Amino acid sequence: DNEKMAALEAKICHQIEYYFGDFNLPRDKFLKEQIKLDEGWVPLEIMIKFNRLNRLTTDFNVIVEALSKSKAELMEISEDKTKIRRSPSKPLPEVTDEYKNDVKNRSVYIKGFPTDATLDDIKEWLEDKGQVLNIQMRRTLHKAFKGSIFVVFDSIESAKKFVETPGQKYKETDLLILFKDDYFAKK
RNA sequence: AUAAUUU
Structure with a gap:
C-alpha cells in the first residue's frame, strides 16, 4: 500500500x-x-x-x-x-564545444514505434536499457507523432551499449536504432 | 493565442 x-x-x-x-x-x-x-x-x-x-x-x-x-x-x-x-549550489553547466560534443555523442535515434504510442509507453520500454536524460518524440508542425524518437543517455558509454544491441523490438515489432549524428549523416 | 506544456 x-x-x-x-x-x-x-x-x-x-x-x-x-x-x-x-x-x-x-x-x-x-x-x-x-x-x-x-x-x-x-x-x-x-x-x-x-x-x-x-x-x-x-x-x-x-x-x-x-x-x-x-x-x-x-x-x-x-x-x-x-x-x-533548483539549488543555487547546483548551477547549470557551462555549454562549451566539449559539452555539446559530449551531448551529441550520447544521443540516439530510434525508428519504428506505433503512431499511437505515448511518452509513458516509451519511457517504460526504455526502463531496462540504461539511464535516459531526455526522450524527444518527433512530431510534425501540427504535432503529429511520426513514430521515431531521439534519446539522450547519461553517458556515451550507456549510449554505445544501447546501439551495440542488434536484437531490440517494441511490443514484438522490429526497431531501427542509430546514433543521432549517424541518422543525420544519411539524411 | 506567452491561451508557450515532458510549460
Whole structure:
C-alpha cells in the first residue's frame, strides 16, 4: 500500500527534476522566465500548471513530502513550503564545444514505434536499457507523432551499449536504432 | 493565442 505512495513520490521527484534539469531548463522559455522573478523560487501554485506533474498529483503537501525525500537532491523547498527552486549550489553547466560534443555523442535515434504510442509507453520500454536524460518524440508542425524518437543517455558509454544491441523490438515489432549524428549523416 | 506544456 504505502509502497504505491513511494512509487508516486519517486515519479513526482523525477518529473520535477526533469523540468529543472540540465537538458530541459536551458531551452525552457516559460521556466527560465519564472526563475527570474523570485531568485529561482517558483510557487507550487505555478508548478501545478505543468501537465505531467498535474497528472501525478495537484496536492502541495504530497509534492513537498516527495521532494524532501528525493535522492537526487536537486531541488530546494522554501521554509514556508509554498515554493521550490533548483539549488543555487547546483548551477547549470557551462555549454562549451566539449559539452555539446559530449551531448551529441550520447544521443540516439530510434525508428519504428506505433503512431499511437505515448511518452509513458516509451519511457517504460526504455526502463531496462540504461539511464535516459531526455526522450524527444518527433512530431510534425501540427504535432503529429511520426513514430521515431531521439534519446539522450547519461553517458556515451550507456549510449554505445544501447546501439551495440542488434536484437531490440517494441511490443514484438522490429526497431531501427542509430546514433543521432549517424541518422543525420544519411539524411 | 506567452491561451508557450515532458510549460
